[model samples]
Target: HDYELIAAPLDVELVPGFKTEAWAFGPSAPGTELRVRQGTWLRVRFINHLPVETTIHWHGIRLPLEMDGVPYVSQLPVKPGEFFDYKFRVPDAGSYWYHPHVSSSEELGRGLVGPLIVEEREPTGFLHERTLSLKTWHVDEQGAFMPFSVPREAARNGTAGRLITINGQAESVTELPAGQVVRVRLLNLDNTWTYRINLKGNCEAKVYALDGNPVTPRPLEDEYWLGPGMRICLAIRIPEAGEEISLRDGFVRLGTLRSVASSEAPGNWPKALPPNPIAEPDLEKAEKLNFNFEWPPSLWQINGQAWDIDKTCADRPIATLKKGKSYIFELKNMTQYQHPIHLHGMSFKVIASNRHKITEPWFTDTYLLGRNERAQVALVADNPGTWMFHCHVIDHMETGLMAAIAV
Candidate 1:
């Protein structure tokens, strides 16, 4: 499917009777939701209307080098009024997102984010679906734009905003068939805050997918923490017609789920979807690489070097690997704050961790690393390219903690 996406300025009613001048892909934040079948060629004509340069990164897709959006790394930034056509086949079927690669903090924080769902070639039985774009706006009570990043906060746990939103609305209510099985895709597109996905009401939920890939269905706990750039797909059974379910981040309600009358009664909960075609890495014969996330006196750093913010590319690849080789990346967080470490153009399995217990290893593009935590991720160097590896916290990434891996 060919689509035209324009990034331009618009006045968004973040608050009642108040309009905030924000950069958006279409009418509002969390741009157009693009859904396509797996293995389909999706072409997008992205026209930039903002005053600054920007580029769209398919957050979790494994595509060709040129199509993997990264300023100067994959392709040049799309300057204002310029356009770029992103053409690639959707390889995986699960929850993913897209956002600007240039000025990561300012642009994304300004409301440039959207959902990109690659559906399975064969239906997974759940006909009802919902996409919740969870984000926070850096705006004042008057709906004026606030600074996207603060030095102190950026150096610590990343910048945070007071205004929280789900699907671009301060309050939202999603209606689904009363007794139908629903697939709710929860995307954490926030600047920094980690959300505790808590479902308060009479509904049964199980984690079905993570980071655009299927996982073994597991019962959803009372609370699940999702970090920035992380995506979780929950297979939930809608409650009774008169009942209401609420989605909360800790004690705060982010949105609500109400059931509508339906002729059909609730069906059986959905099973795990088919796994994506990804080569599993044999840890027994994998190359070992180590990266230390450090908090320097002023900015963040990976290993010992800070990312060249001016050039928008890292000085060098953290490591180079042989094509089709199995590898294990030992990531150590030396800082006192949490970071969602993300790697582009490849999917990985979180194998082991020092802080958290490993129950079931699942495929993911982003993994949350706590303060002073050490974790290892396993992947195969099947996609040949220089792919980005960085902190999902835009503030940390923009400041320094960004790099790449060459295969």
Candidate 2:
């Protein structure tokens, strides 16, 4: 389907009862939810109406290198008052999102974010589904929107908003059919801040997918730490209408469920969706490389180097690779703060984190590295492009922590 998603200056209350000037897509903070079936061609006509130029980067979908949407690396920035056609064959299914690549920390901080969902081959049997775009906004006492680089905040977390939101509004609540299996997809669309979900009440929750790719279905025994640019699909079985159900982050309640009175109590959990067509890396032949997140305090740098701020790729490739080769990226966060590193144009199997084994090789484009945390990610260098690999935190990226991998 064809649509016009605009980037314009707007007065929006990203948080409840507070107004701030936001450069949002359309009139809302979360914009629109663009849905398409799996393996189908989808087109998006993006127009930049704001004074500053911008480009939309599809956060988790796999597609051609040209349409990957890194402002200068993949294509030029869609100039102000101009537009660009983003066309891609939807190869995978799950929750995905889109945002401006240029000045992402600020653009995303203002707004210009939206959700993209590609349906699975078979029906997930989720009687109901909801997309929660976890975002936050920083404001002054007067409720004026704050900039990304707040001295104390940027010294640690990048542009983490004081008011947290889901799908554009704080204290977001959605209704669901009682006694039915409901699917809730979470997209951590914020610039920074890792979200920890506490699904309260006597409910059983199962995580089906992470970052738009299917993983071995697992139950939620504890709260999950979802980092920025990350996506998670969860299936929860809501019981009888005795009380309300909630998903919370610390004391802040993200959302709640008001179950309608009914006798349709679902017994079985939703079936797992068909897995996406992503190749596994050959670990035996995988070349290992270490990327240290060097925090010199003054600015952020990856491997002691930083790319120039603009719609550009790293002049000299940080990690170069040959096509069809396997690679093991050992990302080390050498700072006190966790860094959510996102790799464009490809996803990799998280083999090990902190030297401990994680999900048995599920692919994800973005991975979080805690303070002094290190992870070994395996991937096949099949996608040919100079892909952008950088920390999702806007302050870090703006300061330094950004680079590219030329494959």
Candidate 3:
């Protein structure tokens, strides 16, 4: 399928009566949703109408090198009025998102985010599904945007906004059929707020997928933390008595699932999703690499060096690996704040963690590392290209906590 996405300035009424200045990929503030089938070639013509340079990063999609969309890393930034063509085959079936990689903080902070869903070729028996792109707006009482990045906040835990929205609205409601299984994909595209989604109601919710890959179905707890750039899919079974279930992040209500009577019978829930063709890493033969996420107050760093965007791309890679080799990354967080580290063009299996208990290994493109934590992830360096490795926190990323790896 083909799509034409234009990033331009627009006025959105995010604050009821006032119009908020924002940038959009098309008509909406969060842009328009792009849904495609797995294993299909998708093409997009991206036109930059904004006054500044920008590029779209397909968050968590395992596309080719050029279409990976890391400004200066994979390709040059698309300047104002310039257009770029992005064509790639959707390799996985799950929840993902898209946003700009240039001016990382300000561009996404002003909007410029949207959901990209790759549906499974064989429907996992889910007749009803919903995708929610959760975000927090940095707007004032007059609906004018505040500075996208605050150095003080950026130095600490990163900038977090006050106003929360689901699918670009203040409130979202999904009418669910009673006793039936409904699938809901949640994407946290917020600047910094790690959403602890509390599904405290009369429904049974199971975690079906994480970061665009299907996992063993497990019962979702009363609350779960979804950090920035992470996606979670839930299989919720509505109650027969019909109750309103609130998906809350603390005091803020992100969305609601109201149950209603259905004439159709409740279908059996699938225990698993069709697995994607991800190569298993040979841990016994894997080469181990280490990286430390540190805070230098004004800027963040990986190891002792910060990413210099002005430097030539040839001199910016932190590590180089032979293509098709199995590798393991030992990631450590030296800061007091959380960092959701995202790797481009590859999916990894979270193998171990010193700070958290690992019940099972799961695949994800972004992994959240807690303060003073240590974790290990393994992947096969199959895609031969230079890919970005950075903190998903836009502030930290823009400041310096970004680097690249060549395969």
Question: Model 2 misses residue 265 by how many Å?
Answer: 5.2
Q: Estimate, for each residue in 1-407, the C-alpha lDDT of model 1 and write its tens digit.
A: 87888887878678878888888877657677888878767878888878898888988788887787776658887888888889887777888889988777888888898888888887767877888888988888899988887998777878867787888887787888877888888898887777877877787777778877777888758678798889987777776786778778778878887778998867777667788888588979986858656543436455444444542454444566788988887777776778888877887888878877888888988888888788888989867778887788888888677766777
The model with the greatest lDDT is: 1
Question: Candidates' TM-scores?
Answer: 0.95, 0.93, 0.95
> Per-residue lDDT for 197 in model 2?
71
| Sliding window of 10 residues with minimal summed lDDT for model 1 | 303-312
- Give me candidate 1's TM-score against the actual structure: 0.95
- The CA lDDT at 288 in model 3 is 80
What tens digits encode model 3's per-residue C-alpha lDDT throughout 43-104?
Answer: 77898878898888888788888887776657788888898888888886888899988777
Sort the candidates on lDDT, descending order: 1, 3, 2
